Amino acid sequence: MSKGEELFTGVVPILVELDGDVNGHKFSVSGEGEGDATYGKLTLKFICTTGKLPVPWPTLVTTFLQCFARYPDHMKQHDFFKSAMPEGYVQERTIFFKDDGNYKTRAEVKFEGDTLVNRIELKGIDFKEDGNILGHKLEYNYNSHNVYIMADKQKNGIKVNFKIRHNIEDGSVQLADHYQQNTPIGDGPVLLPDNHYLSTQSALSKDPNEKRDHMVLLEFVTAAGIT
Ligand SMILES: [Ca+2]
Ligand SMILES: [Ca+2]
């Protein structure tokens, strides 16, 4: 019921490009993989191209593709993300790390030909030198979360909020509160959803032959909350 829905019935190649500055530490990440929205499935490999990543890889997972969520057929009228394609959407976030600094991000997600592209600028400030982020105290793992979606009708987009729980090496938890807004790039109509959420599961791993600083990500994203 959108033109965009049909762009995602098969396997779609994905590119991710991020430039970051966290407390003056500048870095870039390039990612490649593919997405199969029929199964809510994402498989991606990220590589830090400027050397060693200066923050923990788990802190960047949410920044590095919600147009690949599997929306059940009865919920397809609530898929804002695909409806903005191919022209795309801007995805903006503030991520507040409890007792620590914050990330501000701006992403443009759209098709470049047949390839779905996520281009990101990230700015992190007020981080603690011996905090869990700059001190690299977060485990290389990931929890499952619900991301809550609301229409923003006076902006023709959506508002999204959720809390990520990052495991800390001492057994504790680093909360990362996400405030998110998405707005279409083009001028065409989009689908404005009723309230609902995306259930997310993610698995981080390493490529045994890769010597560069990297992250392999397997994700499943499923819309829910409307019956
Ligand atoms: Ca450590
Ligand atoms: Ca309605």
Curated annotation (Swiss-Prot):
Contains a chromophore consisting of modified amino acid residues. Maturation of the chromophore requires nothing other than molecular oxygen. Changing residue 96 to S: In alphaGFP/cycle 3 GFP; improves folding at 37 degrees Celsius, reduces aggregation at high concentrations, and increases the diffusibility of the protein inside cells. InterPro entries: GFP, GFP-related, Green_fluorescent_prot. Changing residue 64 to M: In RSGFP4; increases fluorescence and shifts the major exitation peak to 489-490 nm. Changing residue 203 to V: In EBFP1.2; shifts the excitation and emission spectra to shorter wavelengths and increases quantum yields compared to BFP. GO terms for biological process: bioluminescence; generation of precursor metabolites and energy. Changing residue 190 to A: In mut1.5; shifts fluorescence lifetime from 3.03 to 2.72 ns. Changing residue 125 to V: In EBFP2.0; shifts the excitation and emission spectra to shorter wavelengths and increases quantum yields compared to BFP. Changing residue 142 to H: In mut1.3; shifts fluorescence lifetime from 3.03 to 2.78 ns. In mut1.5; shifts fluorescence lifetime from 3.03 to 2.72 ns. In mut1.27; shifts fluorescence lifetime from 3.03 to 2.85 ns. Changing residue 203 to K: Abolishes the tendency to dimerize and leads to monomeric fluorescent proteins. Keywords: Chromophore, Luminescence, Photoprotein. It comes from the Eukaryota. Photocytes. Changing residue 219 to G: Suppresses the 399 nm excitation peak, leaving only the longer wavelength peak at 475 nm. Changing residue 142 to C: In mut1.9; shifts fluorescence lifetime from 3.03 to 2.74 ns. Monomer. Belongs to the GFP family. This is Green fluorescent protein. It comes from Aequorea victoria. The gene is GFP.
